[PDB]
């Protein structure tokens, strides 16, 4: 019976403690105890706590990216609002089923600005897949002749990404509550995208 | 030539260091050096760093509340979207002119959950003034017969409060950039509220 590589064990423990305590409050002593490794092995694979946080972050966002690209490739031809609605439903389900990953991702706010910036630069190339897709699909739309593709794209991304942020924070450490509110959230999201569509297009 | 009371000097220094470093990284040693007081006087007026953060937070949100209630009392009779547009313009101006307060307020995310929760409970009574006002003005509207006052109010507050959050973070430590982007931001905000209005109402 094979176990996790020592690297993946550290990363899973990292995802857990960081998510619980936050970056600043978490200790690599604790992450190592939790991983069932000697304090010094964190140093071998990672060098320092900042680098641990960073690889942990890339490792989780890499998982998410694969999910997304599969979804993209299957639902590419959909109407852009239908696309987003469906995608949000899917992220809602991931989050309730992967609460430790969820709690961890939302910790990106509380890290020193230089660490956070590094992550967003190294992440820009992947987040631009969804961004370029929407920008593309917006061309197939009848935009209200006071609304720029720029404003539409801006509004749409901000709805999409702030919604993520709002529920992750509201339901941090409370997965069963998210699950209880799932159906309502999905229906609220539906109407909201229908408001954007209507207000946004001719 | 009278100076700040020692309490207000501590609080102003608190607002500055917390805003710079964040709650966890900031030290009360540093706040006291910065305030030109002995390390022990923080303890006399405040007891601990958590309590310092909390009074600092109440003190800044108390300033904001007075601004808001004056604005409310003058612009009470406006159309609710016109009201919000104007209010956002005003908050944009405050923030660029009071960048240290701005940077400080956005630190509420990175504090331990129990401190953050305390602040939001003690703050609920004041934030409900704006909330109850909007809820009230929404009754004077022709809501699209798939849109509940609940969803409308939810969408409107989330636009309003996430916009605050987005610009505070985007322009953290960069007041002259906010000022440069002011006019564009105000115009983007205008169109976005016009999209909500249109999508939201008959």
TrEMBL record, chains A, B:
Q: What is this protein identified as?
A: Transcriptional regulator, TetR family
Q: What residue ranges carry the coiled-coil annotation?
A: none
Q: Name one GO biological process term.
A: regulation of DNA-templated transcription
| UniProt keyword terms in alphabetical order | DNA-binding
State the organism of origin.
Answer: Thermotoga maritima (strain ATCC 43589 / DSM 3109 / JCM 10099 / NBRC 100826 / MSB8)
* Domain HTH tetR-type span(s) in chain numbering: 4-64
- Spell out the molecular function terms from Gene Ontology: DNA-binding transcription factor activity; transcription cis-regulatory region binding
Protein origin, superkingdom: Bacteria
UniProt DNA-binding residue ranges: 27-46
Kindly list the organism's lineage. Answer: Bacteria, Thermotogati, Thermotogota, Thermotogae, Thermotogales
Membrane-traversing stretches: none
């Amino acid at each position: 019976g094979h176990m996790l590589s020592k690297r993946d064990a550290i990363l899973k423990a990292a995802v857990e403690v960081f998510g619980k305590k936050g970056y600043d409050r978490a200790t690599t002593d604790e992450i190592a105890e939790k991983a069932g490794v000697a304090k010094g092995l964190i140093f071998h694979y990672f060098k320092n706590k900042e680098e641990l946080y960073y690889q942990a972050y890339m490792s989780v966002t890499e998982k998410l990216q694969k999910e997304f690209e599969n979804f993209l490739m299957k639902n590419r031809n959909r109407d852009i609002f239908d696309f987003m609605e469906r995608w949000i439903e899917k992220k809602l389900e991931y989050s309730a089923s992967h609460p430790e990953e969820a709690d961890f991702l939302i910790t990106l706010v509380s890290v020193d600005e230089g660490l956070r910036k590094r992550i967003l630069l190294d992440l820009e190339k992947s987040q631009r897949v969804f961004f370029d897709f929407v920008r593309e699909k917006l061309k197939d739309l009848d935009l209200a002749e006071d609304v720029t593709e720029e404003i539409a794209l801006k509004f749409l991304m901000w709805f999409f990404s702030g919604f993520e942020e709002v529920y992750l924070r509201t339901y941090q450490g409370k997965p069963e509550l998210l699950k209880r509110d799932m159906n309502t959230l999905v229906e609220e999201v539906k109407v909201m995208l229908r408001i954007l569509k209507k207000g946004m297009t001719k």
